[PDB]
Amino acid sequence: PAVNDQAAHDQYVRSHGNYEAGEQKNRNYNWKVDPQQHRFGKTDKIASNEVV
Amino acid sequence: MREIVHIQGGQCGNQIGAKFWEVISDEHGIDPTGTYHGDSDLQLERINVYYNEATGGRYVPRAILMDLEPGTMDSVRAGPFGQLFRPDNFVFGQTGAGNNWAKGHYTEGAELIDSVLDVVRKEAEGCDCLQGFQITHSLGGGTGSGMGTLLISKVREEYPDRIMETFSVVPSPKVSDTVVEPYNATLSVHQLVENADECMVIDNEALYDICFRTLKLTTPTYGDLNHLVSAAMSGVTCCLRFPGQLNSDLRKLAVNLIPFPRLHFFMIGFAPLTSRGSQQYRALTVPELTQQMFDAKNMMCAADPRHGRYLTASALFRGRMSTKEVDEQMLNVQNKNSSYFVEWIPNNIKSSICDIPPKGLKMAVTFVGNSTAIQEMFKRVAEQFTAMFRRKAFLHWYTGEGMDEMEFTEAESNMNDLVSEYQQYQDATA
Amino acid sequence: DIRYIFIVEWFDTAASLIRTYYLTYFTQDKTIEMYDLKNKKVFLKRCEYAIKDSDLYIGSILNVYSRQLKIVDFADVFTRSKFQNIKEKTFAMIKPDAYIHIGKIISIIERSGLQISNLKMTKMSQEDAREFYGEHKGKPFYDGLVNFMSSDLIVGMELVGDNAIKRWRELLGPTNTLVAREQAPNSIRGLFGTDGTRNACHGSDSPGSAFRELNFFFAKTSKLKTQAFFNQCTCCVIKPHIVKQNQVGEVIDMILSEGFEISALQTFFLDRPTAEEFYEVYKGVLPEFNAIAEHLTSGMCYALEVRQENAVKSFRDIAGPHDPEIAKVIRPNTIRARFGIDRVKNGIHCTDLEDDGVLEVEYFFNALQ
Amino acid sequence: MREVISIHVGQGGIQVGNACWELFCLEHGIQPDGQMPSDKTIGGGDDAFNTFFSETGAGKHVPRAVFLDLEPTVIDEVRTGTYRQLFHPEQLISGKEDAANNFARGHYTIGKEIVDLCLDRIRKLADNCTGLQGFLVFNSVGGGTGSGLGSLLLERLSVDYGKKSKLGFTIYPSPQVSTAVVEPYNSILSTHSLLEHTDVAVMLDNEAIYDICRRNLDIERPTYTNLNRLIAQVISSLTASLRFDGALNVDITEFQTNLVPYPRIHFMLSSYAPIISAEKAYHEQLSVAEITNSAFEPANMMAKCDPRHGKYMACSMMYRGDVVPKDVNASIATIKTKRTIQFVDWCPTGFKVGINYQPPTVVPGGDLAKVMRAVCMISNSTAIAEVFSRLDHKFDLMYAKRAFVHWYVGEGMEEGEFSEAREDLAALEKDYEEVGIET
Amino acid sequence: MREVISIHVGQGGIQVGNACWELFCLEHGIQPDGQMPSDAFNTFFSETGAGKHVPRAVFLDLEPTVIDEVRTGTYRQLFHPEQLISGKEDAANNFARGHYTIGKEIVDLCLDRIRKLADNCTGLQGFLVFNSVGGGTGSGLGSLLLERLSVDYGKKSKLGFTIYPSPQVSTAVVEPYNSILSTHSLLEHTDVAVMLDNEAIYDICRRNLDIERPTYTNLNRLIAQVISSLTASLRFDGALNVDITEFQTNLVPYPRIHFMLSSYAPIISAEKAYHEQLSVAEITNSAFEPANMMAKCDPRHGKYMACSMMYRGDVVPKDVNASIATIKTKRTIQFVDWCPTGFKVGINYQPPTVVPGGDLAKVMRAVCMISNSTAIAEVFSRLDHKFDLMYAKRAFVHWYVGEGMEEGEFSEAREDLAALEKDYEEVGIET
Numbered sequence A: 001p002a003v004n005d006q007a008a009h010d011q012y013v014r015s016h017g018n019y020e021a022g023e024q025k026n027r028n029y030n031w032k033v034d035p036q037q038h039r040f041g042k043t044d045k046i047a048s049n050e051v052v
Numbered sequence B: 001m002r003e004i005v006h007i008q009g010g011q012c013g014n015q016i017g018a019k020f021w022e023v024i025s026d027e028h029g030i031d032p033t034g035t036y037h038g039d040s041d042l043q044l045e046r047i048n049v050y051y052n053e054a055t056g057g058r059y060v061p062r063a064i065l066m067d068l069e070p071g072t073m074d075s076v077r078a079g080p081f082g083q084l085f086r087p088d089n090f091v092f093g094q095t096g097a098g099n100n101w102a103k104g105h106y107t108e109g110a111e112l113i114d115s116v117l118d119v120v121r122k123e124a125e126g127c128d129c130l131q132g133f134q135i136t137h138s139l140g141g142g143t144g145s146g147m148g149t150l151l152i153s154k155v156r157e158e159y160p161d162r163i164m165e166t167f168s169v170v171p172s173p174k175v176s177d178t179v180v181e182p183y184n185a186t187l188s189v190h191q192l193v194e195n196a197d198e199c200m201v202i203d204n205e206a207l208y209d210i211c212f213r214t215l216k217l218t219t220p221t222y223g224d225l226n227h228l229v230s231a232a233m234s235g236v237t238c239c240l241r242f243p244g245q246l247n248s249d250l251r252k253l254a255v256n257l258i259p260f261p262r263l264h265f266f267m268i269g270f271a272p273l274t275s276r277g278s279q280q281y282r283a284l285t286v287p288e289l290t291q292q293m294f295d296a297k298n299m300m301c302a303a304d305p306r307h308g309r310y311l312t313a314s315a316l317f318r319g320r321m322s323t324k325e326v327d328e329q330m331l332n333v334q335n336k337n338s339s340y341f342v343e344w345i346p347n348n349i350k351s352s353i354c355d356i357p358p359k360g361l362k363m364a365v366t367f368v369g370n371s372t373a374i375q376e377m378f379k380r381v382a383e384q385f386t387a388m389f390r391r392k393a394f395l396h397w398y399t400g401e402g403m404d405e406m407e408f409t410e411a412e413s414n415m416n417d418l419v420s421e422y423q424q425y426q427d428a429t430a
Numbered sequence C: 001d002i003r004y005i006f007i008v009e010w011f012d013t014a015a016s017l018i019r020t021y022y023l024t025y026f027t028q029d030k031t032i033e034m035y036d037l038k039n040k041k042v043f044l045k046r047c048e049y050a051i052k053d054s055d056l057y058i059g060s061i062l063n064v065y066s067r068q069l070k071i072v073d074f075a076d077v078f079t080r081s082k083f084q085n086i087k088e089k090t091f092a093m094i095k096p097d098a099y100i101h102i103g104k105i106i107s108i109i110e111r112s113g114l115q116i117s118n119l120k121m122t123k124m125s126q127e128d129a130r131e132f133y134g135e136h137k138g139k140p141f142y143d144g145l146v147n148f149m150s151s152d153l154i155v156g157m158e159l160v161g162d163n164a165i166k167r168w169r170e171l172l173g174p175t176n177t178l179v180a181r182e183q184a185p186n187s188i189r190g191l192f193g194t195d196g197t198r199n200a201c202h203g204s205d206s207p208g209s210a211f212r213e214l215n216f217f218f219a220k221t222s223k224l225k226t227q228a229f230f231n232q233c234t235c236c237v238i239k240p241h242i243v244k245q246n247q248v249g250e251v252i253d254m255i256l257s258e259g260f261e262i263s264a265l266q267t268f269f270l271d272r273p274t275a276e277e278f279y280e281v282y283k284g285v286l287p288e289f290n291a292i293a294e295h296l297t298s299g300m301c302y303a304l305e306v307r308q309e310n311a312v313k314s315f316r317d318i319a320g321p322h323d324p325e326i327a328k329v330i331r332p333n334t335i336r337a338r339f340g341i342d343r344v345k346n347g348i349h350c351t352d353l354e355d356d357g358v359l360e361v362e363y364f365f366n367a368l369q
Numbered sequence D: 001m002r003e004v005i006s007i008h009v010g011q012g013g014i015q016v017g018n019a020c021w022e023l024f025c026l027e028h029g030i031q032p033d034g035q036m037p038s039d040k041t042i043g044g045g046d047d048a049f050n051t052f053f054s055e056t057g058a059g060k061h062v063p064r065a066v067f068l069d070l071e072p073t074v075i076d077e078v079r080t081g082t083y084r085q086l087f088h089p090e091q092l093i094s095g096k097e098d099a100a101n102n103f104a105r106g107h108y109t110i111g112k113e114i115v116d117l118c119l120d121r122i123r124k125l126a127d128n129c130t131g132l133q134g135f136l137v138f139n140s141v142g143g144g145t146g147s148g149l150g151s152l153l154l155e156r157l158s159v160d161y162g163k164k165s166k167l168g169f170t171i172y173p174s175p176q177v178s179t180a181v182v183e184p185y186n187s188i189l190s191t192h193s194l195l196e197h198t199d200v201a202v203m204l205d206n207e208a209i210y211d212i213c214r215r216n217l218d219i220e221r222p223t224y225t226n227l228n229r230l231i232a233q234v235i236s237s238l239t240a241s242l243r244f245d246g247a248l249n250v251d252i253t254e255f256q257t258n259l260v261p262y263p264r265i266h267f268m269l270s271s272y273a274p275i276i277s278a279e280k281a282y283h284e285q286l287s288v289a290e291i292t293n294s295a296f297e298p299a300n301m302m303a304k305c306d307p308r309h310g311k312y313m314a315c316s317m318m319y320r321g322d323v324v325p326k327d328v329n330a331s332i333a334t335i336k337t338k339r340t341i342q343f344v345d346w347c348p349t350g351f352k353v354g355i356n357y358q359p360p361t362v363v364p365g366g367d368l369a370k371v372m373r374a375v376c377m378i379s380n381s382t383a384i385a386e387v388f389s390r391l392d393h394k395f396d397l398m399y400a401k402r403a404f405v406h407w408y409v410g411e412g413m414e415e416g417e418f419s420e421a422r423e424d425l426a427a428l429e430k431d432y433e434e435v436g437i438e439t
Numbered sequence E: 001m002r003e004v005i006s007i008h009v010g011q012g013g014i015q016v017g018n019a020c021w022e023l024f025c026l027e028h029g030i031q032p033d034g035q036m037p038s039d040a041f042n043t044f045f046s047e048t049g050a051g052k053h054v055p056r057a058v059f060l061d062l063e064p065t066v067i068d069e070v071r072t073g074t075y076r077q078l079f080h081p082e083q084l085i086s087g088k089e090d091a092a093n094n095f096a097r098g099h100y101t102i103g104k105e106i107v108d109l110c111l112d113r114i115r116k117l118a119d120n121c122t123g124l125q126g127f128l129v130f131n132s133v134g135g136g137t138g139s140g141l142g143s144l145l146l147e148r149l150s151v152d153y154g155k156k157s158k159l160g161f162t163i164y165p166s167p168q169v170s171t172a173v174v175e176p177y178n179s180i181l182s183t184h185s186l187l188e189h190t191d192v193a194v195m196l197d198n199e200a201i202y203d204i205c206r207r208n209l210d211i212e213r214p215t216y217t218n219l220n221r222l223i224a225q226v227i228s229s230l231t232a233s234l235r236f237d238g239a240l241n242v243d244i245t246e247f248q249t250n251l252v253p254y255p256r257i258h259f260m261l262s263s264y265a266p267i268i269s270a271e272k273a274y275h276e277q278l279s280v281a282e283i284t285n286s287a288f289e290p291a292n293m294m295a296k297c298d299p300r301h302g303k304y305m306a307c308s309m310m311y312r313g314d315v316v317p318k319d320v321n322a323s324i325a326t327i328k329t330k331r332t333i334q335f336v337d338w339c340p341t342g343f344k345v346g347i348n349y350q351p352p353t354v355v356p357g358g359d360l361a362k363v364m365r366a367v368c369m370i371s372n373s374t375a376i377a378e379v380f381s382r383l384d385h386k387f388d389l390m391y392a393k394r395a396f397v398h399w400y401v402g403e404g405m406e407e408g409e410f411s412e413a414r415e416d417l418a419a420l421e422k423d424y425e426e427v428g429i430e431t
């Protein structure tokens, strides 16, 4: 096969942006929160029925 | 004596009820499970105004929940105080209205009325003496304006000597909630005007206008707008249940509000209203209530009152207060705006006093008045309707259930006639 | 998101029927929702309320909307998985030798992170005294110890909290009382203990042993009865907010120092039918009648009995004016002025007259039981 | 008490219909092997999920779907995967010979031996349900095999049942991308069958979908797998209200009477947003105002067309999330005042506001990331004329010298059928122009 | 409730943009990663609901090298993931190239990006745009950007901190052309433009900072402070607030002349700064010193029409007016005849921040001046002559015509440059 390997798969990512079908641009930031959880959004303050 | 029943149709009518009954319930201190827990004997004196009795000592509200779809009905039950309703009186359909007015008045709704017309009959005769009917429904929805209006028309023929009230939330022009808003509203008034003893317009647009400029809140919810109305609805019927200087039943409000046979539409405004942080700085004096209660921004309708003249004015002062101060404030305001009050009806303000104030405050006022300002709300609806009909847009659904083009034309004729006649007296002089 | 379900049952009053629900709990945003087992219809539409994370444990109760409902057992397997390790149950008691310090010892328990769930005080009996220690019968000191157990009042309480049993044990210190002070002076035993057999308190060691001692002293059918003396006495009830604010030890400790002989006290969880009627007398005064009777229903509440010479007058002279907001200005040393914060939560409550008090104290401990 | 019967016909429709069941199954809380999760066996006391599942009396919840395809390869793939244990064994009816993109073959020659079983399957599913609301049918107009079967079912269903609502999630031919070499033919004839039988037709052209994925999701090599989910996510948006508590619910019987101005016009193009990859998502608050503004942006239109080229008749968009009703009122007010987007003259108001309390749930490991606020739109604007005109023009060239018409003549398909079909598309095209002219 | 958007274009503009962000980031209390280690800061940033913040900026350019440095350094987390629009090819100082051949296909994404940001904000005050005329790409793209900006929005104010070429020190060889075409476009679109030529800057650091080897890293730093000095009033409590909108009505005498020259003081190294008191009298004295003009012009060579100077530091107001009296009395600084009072005093409280590893030393007081000067005609005078000489024999002309531009466009620039010179002479004549 003489196939490329994940050890070389990432390198090709950095060189010419050559990927495999259906995979995403990984920038490897520093997530203080877990990407899978946490709804990645902003919440505007909303209390109970204030007219009470 | 002089008791009333409660009937609601469509989710707009039903949703409103969820607050009124919870709004009204607190006043007498009835706990959710029907066990009395109030302080004063006055709290129990007129439990006959809206309630009844049953074995076991637990009370129950007399309501009629009528609609064609299960989404709205299955929800209100689970809410707080939702266990008070008798499951026997529940009635519901299985198909759904789909917002087609013709669908909810002749094709589907007409079939299910017999069951609903049955429930209404027992309560009316089952009481000591029936005073009238109060109903909450939406003029902007297919199931409401179609099936809702059917209930009133049949009822009126049966009980010629009773009065009725309808608190309809007419759809404002800027924000529309149903692409069929024009048709289902224009047709609705046709039947309503003939037999509806009374009808007062409340604008959802006003609901949003009042909150963001007076209460000083950040994000209202559907309950927020709902809460006020349920408090408001008690205002007209507040003085029928508690002792006071000048008691005034629902009819008495009728006598001094409708000068002529057809002009029978009203608008309301609630005060006082102070914000969370502004709840203490404002000083409470009887003159304080008057300014806002006639204040333009306090009117609960989109129509601007300053663009017309008041045919008649009514006011229900709430709580204990010096009798004269109630009047002296009223007359002065009557002269200080002599131009805005039509000149051919002297002494065009009524007053009332109820000694038991709503819990949480010390003095409050509910505004009701028939004014030439309500002219605009029809014209805005009139302009929209004429646009669509010329191109027969959105018409196939309505005509496919037996309706014929002429009936639509006839409804408009009455609609415009009411608007034209209303401005007839605006320029009238003595 | 993440859900825990506790099937619940409510004891209505219209008829003998009883019903069960699910009483779901959204830990994501503290929302409440309930569902009924009969007719399979939605009951509570997932609204907001006031339920605290520590008030949800097997064998506890919490009110919602003037309805008394309590947990029964685990609903789904998912729930019994998370709470299997946390939320044990271990019982505690205080020997009569520490009677004149009872309020203080209670003080540190709350601060530690546990919860005071149940509490009772009674006078042990010789016949059951031997039954109290079923395993130590043969030991040489077993007889002598039993002889001492029948001296004077005993204060009982159940400790519930995350890993409570071990946390309780490390709070006492070493077995012998003498050795504790040399090594552990920050424990109950390092401050109050006197001799080897007069250990400040005795606790539960093993979960297998922890179960029995809890039933024996808090079962529906127990041999120990209240010892409330109904002559020359006045009654007072600690309002719930003190338990929620974690100062109950302070309130109790305050009245012990005055020399009062504290006679009887047993917890009481109560609902509307037994709340309004007790305060029903004030119908014509205290225009806050509904609230004070209302708030009395929410959360645990202690019941107290006090007697020195003149039950009401002598105690009322330190009970002070009913309005706490004005108590501070004219009564700094009185009880409430240190805790009262507003009109409807004014801490300790005192009856009105000496001649009327007796029946009040008889209500809790004679009929309500 | 509301149920809906799901029908899938045609390979491309099969895969798309495949994904949606993963999105729907994940949303409610049902495990892959049919039996509820052991952890929360009876946790879900409320019967909210009835909208798509029917109790077996004792056990799992059987999907309310019927999968059809005249070629065993793709379906046999379905009946060997991890979901093999979910669908009813004897409802996935498979044939013997493929239609080979021969529409005449898929409607007059082979289909007559399998239509009956499909109808029988349709009937038995309904009897269990009590309140049938309507029919959702997926099918790919680009394939002959789907087209012939797809046309037949609607006509058969329209007569067997009657007035029940009918909807179709088709995928028409891309303006410039193509898959087969005879797509112009099979598309035009198919439109004839679906024109006079369906109340609503949706636009999901695949050419735009590829464009949509690249610009936001940041994926340079998209395959059919990514395309399928988006539609599956789109489906949940319209059907979210029927199965969750809602401050303002909208019924499928309520959708029909607010989107079709006239008896003939029953098409519209949809769009969805926001769709932000988890890598670059949390940098924006995702306000109610900005999401709506991007909603009408030409780029995010799921269908390859330019709405600026025409007018708007009526758009019904349902939100989902924690939107504040005033904020919803906040968004619309701005849109109308805008000048770049203009409505048709005879419709002063064209918004149907919808809100919900159930936000989307993210399929694990996918491109999409979780977000509180989401909105789906489907508008019927005069822009759709471009696709119909573009398809029609392509038809004229081939028919100039009867190229490729000999095979369709080989399956009992009358020659004049093309003559009659051509007129209807031309008739439809003239319909759009007449409606848009000002009064 | 007031916000301002930042627009940057060109390598110098991009690099000059980077410099201002380090000062702003370290000024308000945000680490480079974007998180906050536990309402004024809204003036430049926004909140995404949880955690970090997203600066309100947009970067445009045609060459990826400079920008690609950003997305690989320590400031990678901050800027918007997609707002750093990047092209594929370089214009290569062919001013035409950046306006009719390559700029047309990329400006579109720019207009959309600005469209989004304006929606989120509520109090759009104005646009501050940096662009260098000394380079082709930075010129052509900038010109179209400003042209589309005005027509799309309307009356919203704009600011441009351009960078023209030095009198004698030069960077490119075609600077005379791209410089001329820049002024014509910016003349009718940018309300306020500050000259910041380099040749003064090198004289600024060496004369004071005693840095004999200044590098572009340090040069960008000075403009970073000045942006801090001018914007400081918008994001801190003050006894006298002067808003960005309150500049066009205190610095522009006529609709045409809308150019001012910048200058800064004091600048002193921490090794030598702490042996003098730094009194207000001298600090204002050093402000008008001909040495210190941030731009290469001679103040002694012309009139003054208006000079708005913003103190910032702990200066007590009382010293303010007295200093003004000192300036007005010296006979060596003569104001224009028709303007009696030529000052608009502004004061702030927050002391200037010092970035670690910098050259400037923390001072308790400072002055930043932005005033129109009649001398500014010197650069136009010198530049106009240069264009005439090289255009005599159509040097380099055969290329610019190679990107679609017409020959007639160049000629009209010459006439316009003549008009600007004529007006300046007219304004100087006493009545």
Ligand SMILES: Nc1nc2c(ncn2[C@@H]2O[C@H](COP(=O)(O)OP(=O)(O)OP(=O)(O)O)[C@@H](O)[C@H]2O)c(=O)[nH]1
Pocket (backbone or CB within 6 Å): D009, D010, D011, D012, D013, D014, D015, D016, D071, D098, D099, D100, D101, D102, D140, D141, D142, D143, D144, D145, D146, D171, D178, D179, D180, D183, D206, D224, D225, D227, D228
């Ligand atoms: N949305 C979507 N469309 C697809 C996909 N694959 C194929 N198509 C479309 O489907 C058309 C062909 O019909 P398919 O449904 O794919 O296959 P089929 O149903 O078996 O029809 P035949 O190929 O004629 O047998 C092609 O022109 C494509 O445009 C897919 O994965 N997703």
Ligand SMILES: Nc1nc2c(ncn2[C@@H]2O[C@H](COP(=O)(O)OP(=O)(O)OP(=O)(O)O)[C@@H](O)[C@H]2O)c(=O)[nH]1
Pocket (backbone or CB within 6 Å): E009, E010, E011, E012, E015, E063, E090, E091, E092, E093, E132, E133, E134, E135, E136, E137, E138, E139, E163, E164, E165, E171, E172, E198, E216, E217, E219, E220
């Ligand atoms: N003050 C200052 N100016 C710079 C710096 N770097 C570049 N410049 C200016 O940029 C001009 C040359 O153009 P470039 O820096 O190459 O960028 P450009 O103007 O957009 O033209 P391009 O080369 O096409 O990118 C010079 O005349 C300088 O005035 C810097 O670090 N500091």
Ligand SMILES: Nc1nc2c(ncn2[C@@H]2O[C@H](COP(=O)(O)OP(=O)(O)O)[C@@H](O)[C@H]2O)c(=O)[nH]1
Pocket (backbone or CB within 6 Å): B009, B010, B011, B012, B015, B072, B097, B099, B138, B140, B141, B142, B143, B144, B169, B171, B177, B178, B204, B207, B222, B223, B225, B226, D247, D248
């Ligand atoms: N203020 C307020 N109005 C409501 C609420 N729910 C519904 N409405 C009104 O009801 C109208 C639409 O009702 P509709 O959906 O047709 O009711 P249905 O026909 O019974 O389904 C809208 O114009 C709303 O203004 C609510 O919670 N609050």
Ligand SMILES: [Mg+2]
Pocket (backbone or CB within 6 Å): D011, D071, D098, D143, D145
């Ligand atoms: Mg196929």
Ligand SMILES: [Mg+2]
Pocket (backbone or CB within 6 Å): E011, E063, E090, E091, E092, E135, E137
């Ligand atoms: Mg370059």
